[PDB]
Design an enzyme around this catalytic site. Structure first.
Site, short mmCIF file in Angstrom:
data_model
loop_
_atom_site.label_atom_id
_atom_site.label_comp_id
_atom_site.label_asym_id
_atom_site.label_seq_id
_atom_site.Cartn_x
_atom_site.Cartn_y
_atom_site.Cartn_z
N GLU B 55 -0.84 1.93 -6.49
CA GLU B 55 0.14 1.86 -5.40
C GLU B 55 1.54 2.31 -5.83
O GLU B 55 2.30 2.83 -5.01
CB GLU B 55 0.23 0.44 -4.83
CG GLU B 55 -0.96 0.01 -4.02
CD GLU B 55 -2.08 -0.52 -4.88
OE1 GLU B 55 -1.92 -0.55 -6.12
OE2 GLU B 55 -3.12 -0.91 -4.31
N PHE B 117 -5.82 -16.33 -0.56
CA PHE B 117 -6.30 -15.24 -1.35
C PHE B 117 -5.42 -14.03 -1.09
O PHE B 117 -5.06 -13.75 0.01
CB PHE B 117 -7.74 -15.00 -0.98
CG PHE B 117 -8.34 -13.77 -1.54
CD1 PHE B 117 -8.58 -13.63 -2.86
CD2 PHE B 117 -8.71 -12.76 -0.70
CE1 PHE B 117 -9.17 -12.50 -3.34
CE2 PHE B 117 -9.29 -11.63 -1.16
CZ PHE B 117 -9.52 -11.50 -2.48
N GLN B 118 -5.06 -13.32 -2.14
CA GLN B 118 -4.18 -12.16 -2.08
C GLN B 118 -2.92 -12.32 -1.25
O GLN B 118 -2.48 -11.42 -0.64
CB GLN B 118 -4.92 -10.91 -1.67
CG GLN B 118 -6.21 -10.75 -2.40
CD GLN B 118 -6.63 -9.31 -2.52
OE1 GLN B 118 -6.68 -8.77 -3.58
NE2 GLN B 118 -6.96 -8.73 -1.43
N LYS B 167 -3.27 -9.36 8.97
CA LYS B 167 -4.57 -8.79 9.33
C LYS B 167 -4.97 -9.07 10.78
O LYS B 167 -5.51 -8.19 11.46
CB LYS B 167 -5.65 -9.31 8.39
CG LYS B 167 -7.02 -8.71 8.65
CD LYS B 167 -8.05 -9.21 7.67
CE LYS B 167 -9.42 -8.71 8.04
NZ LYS B 167 -10.47 -9.18 7.10
N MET B 486 15.51 8.83 -25.71
CA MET B 486 16.80 8.31 -25.26
C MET B 486 17.10 6.97 -25.92
O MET B 486 18.26 6.64 -26.17
CB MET B 486 16.81 8.18 -23.74
CG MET B 486 18.15 7.78 -23.13
SD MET B 486 19.18 9.18 -22.63
CE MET B 486 19.98 9.58 -24.18
#
Ligand SMILES: Cc1cc2nc3c(=O)[nH]c(=O)nc-3n(C[C@H](O)[C@H](O)[C@H](O)COP(=O)(O)OP(=O)(O)OC[C@H]3O[C@@H](n4cnc5c(N)ncnc54)[C@H](O)[C@@H]3O)c2cc1C
Ligand SMILES: Cc1cc2nc3c(=O)[nH]c(=O)nc-3n(C[C@H](O)[C@H](O)[C@H](O)COP(=O)(O)OP(=O)(O)OC[C@H]3O[C@@H](n4cnc5c(N)ncnc54)[C@H](O)[C@@H]3O)c2cc1C
Ligand SMILES: COc1cnc(OC)n2nc(NS(=O)(=O)c3c(OCC(F)F)cccc3C(F)(F)F)nc12
Ligand SMILES: COc1cnc(OC)n2nc(NS(=O)(=O)c3c(OCC(F)F)cccc3C(F)(F)F)nc12
Ligand SMILES: Cc1ncc(C[n+]2c([C@@](C)(O)OO)sc(CCOP(=O)(O)OP(=O)(O)O)c2C)c(N)n1
Ligand SMILES: C/C(NCc1cnc(C)nc1N)=C(/S)CCOP(=O)([O-])OP(=O)([O-])O
Ligand SMILES: [Mg+2]
Ligand SMILES: [Mg+2]
Lengths: 596, 591
Positions: B55, B117-118, B167, B486
């Site tokens: 993602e 959940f999630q 959802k 760097m």
């Protein structure tokens, strides 16, 4: 009382000293500008081993796997801005699964904070909802205090992640004031009340005729947990089921083992829970991935409670999770293991439970973990791989640790592996983070250098964090990476097959050549296609000295069963049916115009 | 009231709304919570979908897409870990002002707040790294929230917004019609324009300090060029302003700041008037703020100059430096209104004589190749700049973060707007590859080159296979110095060459490329560089070129510590050799 011993040291140097005082032997991290004063202080330090990932998310998941395998907090050291935001997912992951972790993030100088500076993030704000606690150290004087508070909070109660924000000027600053010695050093009525509730719970247990032990991750947060669980199980003849996160806490070879319960749990475990008059919940939080439709959950226990002869007992360490989902008859507050030990003498020894175990054994015979097995010309079955690898790995005589990604391979690993040992299943359950598998394995391998560590992964999951393959080589972690390649996001195609009429919307990612990838990363790469080569390849896999990746091409569009979904109760699972799978295959071919 | 959405699921409404918002590309990754939306956009003809491996990739792709196209980037991911994985791109887009609309699936409303959940508190997590966010609570308000999101992301200073999609909301069917709609001070500005034009006409040593703001309008570069030509004003740009001005124009000062051209820095310090256009005076630009632009402050005290700031966001006005005249609003718009009030200047003899002497005295000098020596990273940039230009194609450049990024900024000759796409404010390693992929989607005919570092590339290299699946023929250049350059530079400079964990073990990048489905190319020898660069650019399809470059090479000039812009560290061949011997001594010959 003041302590002057740190006077003259930089904040970074103080950090370094606090690590050995906090018994830290491993630090996972990645350097950057804001955290440079700390990195200069730990340069060539022999206080701990440093592990360098390719991505800070990797550091986070490594620390998690380390924590799960060792029982010690995972320590992360990253820079400000993108360094800090890159560990948000691991913190949220550790928060959901109760994993002790101390995350140190470098921060822009205090004078630059709130000015939208170079690499500045409001990390304390971002991570507030996904840590037990966080803090920004505002002076070098309070640095040891904050470090001590972080480690204590991370490892007490329900373990979890904490974040400590470290401004560059603070870690570069020299301590020029003595600080309280206490900040540098790492109820009778309550005890009586806990004992009261322990007595009540013992009374309920001695009354039960169909008890079930419902066991979760909490039992594993004490070294003696599995031992006392077994003693209670044997003494009162109580069958034991575990959550996904309790796997390994109970010997699944034991006759009283019910295996896993829940959405994809064993039918026997699910049925036992649905018919029990008493549910003894030990270190588990009643998530809906376990209970299914909550109104249909444990009807026999609810009936027993209404008749004052059973119900639900809850051994829970956190007040937040008591009476959260289920009305419980008795809550026993505190460490589950400790309270089981206190209760033991109060439990009447039970000779046998003939009827109850007869019913359970009949369920076992009727509802095994059935699936469509290999036939001539067919692809390798993913369930078969787990069963074979489970035996192969176990026969080595080594201590085995298993990590996974998220999806079908994860559930199949949970189901078909035979679990016997505590802290040997390390998987992302609450947040369910794809990509967890490889970095968690590396972390676990660091924690347990002698253990055989196997990442049972999915192809889509593995793609998320596969860059950490090279990190395993650099860290000297000989992890065993197993890829069950079904060339799909299987758990999602399963749901699309079932509820969206085989419309597979963007669930097939283009995989790389995993074998060429492994070798590019400096590992040995192995592949199996043929059924006839699976055995030999699995043995070569496990027998390889260094890190190794084995890709198994497995069959596609295979659902994980049993499955409790929709408004179904735990006893209304979908069971495996060979004719149904065949029909689903025809239907799928037609609906996808032959593509799948 | 409108009935055109009645009977549609929330997901189907989302599909239609993308069409109405003129979205042609969505970047995303599916999952449980966002499933009803993915079902509705299944085989949608309303836009193209790009599937990454992570993602974060989707996020950075959307950023690169937005920056090349001028349209907002759209992200569609699931709840929990899907959402937390786009926090870094959101913080990145927030820091650099990039228009992005992030759609995150969320657990059902019946499960929100229950630690399901999630489940993540995404609205809470993303609050500080979005302009605005919201959780859609019913299907009726879904079009309204989508319209608000796109409006907010693209107005004022552009930036990321987040829309949380439960959802059950996206699965729900719209039963009821919804309002069709949901589907004075200018005088104060004019006064400022007049006053700022008075200051400009009065200035004797003016400098145009130009940033990303001028690129947020199509006619930005044109009006900038007009003002510069009309009043003969030298133009310097920030890192994020590169491309807005033709660097081949005699009035170009190149980039200013921490690693800016010395001529640019010296002009700013000696200017009597600084005209800030779409720039926020970040300290990577100003250096020590108390030493910044002493001549401008002096002119201000005598009422003959100072600082003028064309800024769209009021909170960025007088935030860092005290300004004499503030012109609120779109810079391009206000430049247009001002143009007619600016006296034409024939020439500025003294001012440009002083500038042209600095140019001759302080070029981007560095230790060049010698027989037997390794390839120099700066040389690669110069050669690639010409080779890429010689193709005649439209060229877009992305980078990672570090030394390669600065060298890309410095030694490339920037001439075209929206052709340099780099992570500046947040400075996110791993930006280069996914940003290049997104930019290639935005501009399919363009030659898109990721000038990346080895450490940066390792962060997100998994997206290499995504490039193949998306059909984006990106050109990936890895300046491989086998170090976090760097950081080693700062460790060499401020920490006595103590290289603490700044050397990651790289994979074989060529074998990696091939494993991912790309062509892989490698250069070690100076003699091979020219041929390999030409093959690199002329290759059809995605291709990776690794160049082994010299190690422990500092980016110069450099303004650090408490130094002012005119107090830069400049390149010196003898100093470099002395540094090499000192480094060898202190590292026991390891570096
Ligand atoms: C694809 C997928 C499918 C899944 N399906 C299932 C499934 O079928 N079955 C299943 O079980 N899970 C499943 N899950 C996982 C599920 O979401 C949860 O993660 C899991 O059920 C939680 O297990 P747990 O309650 O034992 O552990 P935890 O979430 O960690 O909860 C532990 C509880 O015990 C408490 N506790 C902690 N320490 C102590 C202590 N020392 N003393 C007392 N109490 C303590 C904690 O406060 C907490 O309340 C699935 C996950 C995924 C990704
Ligand atoms: C390793 C490294 C080194 C760096 N060194 C340098 C360096 O030497 N020199 C340098 O310049 N940068 C450097 N940076 C980048 C630096 O951190 C900032 O990203 C950059 O200086 C900011 O550029 P900017 O102000 O032009 O753009 P922005 O940060 O996007 O600011 C634009 C300003 O204009 C405003 N604005 C936006 N749109 C409009 C509009 N339509 N009308 C009016 N105003 C508008 C915005 O509100 C904002 O105030 C470096 C970054 C890294 C990672
Ligand atoms: C490898 O370290 C660096 C690389 N590049 C950098 O700037 C482009 N910096 N900058 C710093 N430190 S810093 O300059 O003190 C600073 C900073 O400077 C403020 C100060 F100069 F006033 C502001 C915000 C952040 C940082 C940070 F995070 F990097 F530490 N370290 C590096
Ligand atoms: C590919 O989709 C899924 C895969 N695995 C899953 O569970 C292990 N779920 N679960 C769901 N949806 S869910 O069941 O309605 C649900 C959920 O269930 C609430 C409902 F069951 F009451 C709770 C929290 C999150 C989710 C989520 F985000 F995943 F959608 N979708 C999947
Ligand atoms: C997610 C993340 N983590 C760490 C970072 C801190 N930084 C950097 C910096 C400047 O932002 O310092 O603050 S640059 C850098 C390493 C650059 O290695 P390279 O790609 O090889 O390029 P080069 O040509 O060698 O220089 C690090 C570690 C960062 N920005 N992002
Ligand atoms: C996309 C997704 N779920 C949503 C999702 C999205 N994004 C992240 C970071 N994590 C999760 N869990 C799954 S389960 C993918 C499964 O694919 P897999 O790795 O190959 O496993 P398998 O195919 O066996 O089911
Ligand atoms: Mg898969
Ligand atoms: Mg490098």
């Amino acid at each position: 009382d003041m302590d002057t011993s740190f006077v003259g040291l930089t904040g970074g140097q103080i950090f370094n000293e606090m690590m050995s005082r906090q018994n830290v032997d491993t630090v996972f991290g990645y350097p950057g500008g804001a955290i440079l004063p700390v990195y200069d202080a730990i340069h060539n330090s022999d206080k701990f081993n440093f592990v360098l990932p390719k991505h800070e998310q990797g550091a986070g998941h490594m620390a998690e796997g380390y924590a799960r395998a060792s029982g010690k907090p995972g320590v992360v050291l990253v820079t400000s801005g993108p360094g800090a935001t890159n560990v948000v997912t691991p913190m949220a992951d550790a928060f959901a699964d109760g994993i002790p972790m101390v995350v140190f993030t470098g921060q822009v100088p205090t004078s630059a904070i709130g000015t939208d500076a170079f690499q500045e993030a409001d990390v304390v704000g971002i991570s507030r909802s996904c840590t037990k606690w966080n803090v920004m150290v505002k002076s070098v004087e309070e640095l040891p205090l904050r470090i001590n508070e972080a480690f204590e909070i991370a490892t007490s109660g329900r373990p979890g992640p904490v974040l400590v924000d470290l401004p560059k000027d603070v870690t570069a600053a020299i301590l020029r004031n003595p600080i309280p010695t206490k900040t540098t050093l790492p109820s009778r009525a309550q005890d009586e009340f806990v004992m009261q509730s322990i007595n009540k719970a013992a009374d309920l247990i001695n009354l039960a005729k169909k008890p079930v032990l419902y066991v979760g991750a909490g039992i594993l947060n004490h070294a003696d947990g599995p031992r006392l669980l077994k003693e209670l199980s044997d003494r009162a003849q109580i069958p034991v089921t575990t959550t996904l996160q309790g796997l390994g806490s109970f010997d699944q070879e034991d006759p009283k083992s019910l295996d896993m319960l829940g959405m994809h749990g064993c039918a026997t475990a699910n049925l036992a829970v649905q018919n029990a008059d008493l549910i003894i919940a030990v270190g588990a939080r009643f998530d809906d991935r376990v209970t299914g439709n909550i109104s249909k959950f444990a009807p026999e226990a609810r009936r027993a409670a209404a008749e004052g002869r059973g119900g639900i007992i809850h051994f829970e360490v956190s007040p937040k999770n008591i009476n959260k989902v289920v009305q419980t008859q008795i809550a026993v507050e505190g460490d589950a293991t400790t309270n089981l030990g206190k209760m033991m003498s109060k439990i009447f020894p039970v000779k046998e439970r003939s009827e109850w175990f007869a019913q359970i054994n009949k369920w076992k015979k009727e509802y095994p973990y059935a699936y469509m097995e290999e036939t001539p010309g067919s692809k390798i079955k993913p369930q078969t791989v787990i069963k074979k690898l489970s035996k192969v790995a176990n026969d080595t005589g080594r201590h085995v640790i298993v990590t996974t990604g998220v999806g079908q391979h994860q559930m199949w690993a949970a189901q078909h592996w035979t679990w016997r040992n505590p802290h040997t299943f390390i998987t992302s359950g609450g947040l369910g983070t794809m990509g967890y598998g490889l970095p968690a394995a590396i972390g676990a391998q660091v924690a347990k250098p002698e253990s055989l560590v196997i990442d049972i992964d999915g192809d889509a999951s593995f793609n998320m964090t596969l860059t950490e393959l090279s990190s395993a080589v650099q860290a000297g972690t000989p992890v065993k990476i197993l890829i069950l390649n079904n060339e799909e996001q299987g758990m999602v195609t399963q749901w699309q097959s079932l509820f969206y009429e085989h419309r597979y919307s963007h669930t097939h990612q283009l995989n790389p050549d995993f074998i060429k990838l492994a070798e590019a990363m400096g590992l040995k790469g192995l592949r199996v296609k043929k059924q006839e080569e699976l055995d030999a390849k699995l043995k070569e896999f496990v027998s390889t000295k260094g890190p190794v990746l084995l890709e198994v091409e497995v069959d596609k569009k295979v659902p994980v069963l049993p499955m409790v979904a929709g408004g179904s109760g735990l006893d209304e699972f979908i069971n495996f049916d060979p004719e149904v799978e065949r029909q689903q295959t025809e239907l799928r071919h037609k609906r996808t115009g032959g593509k799948h």
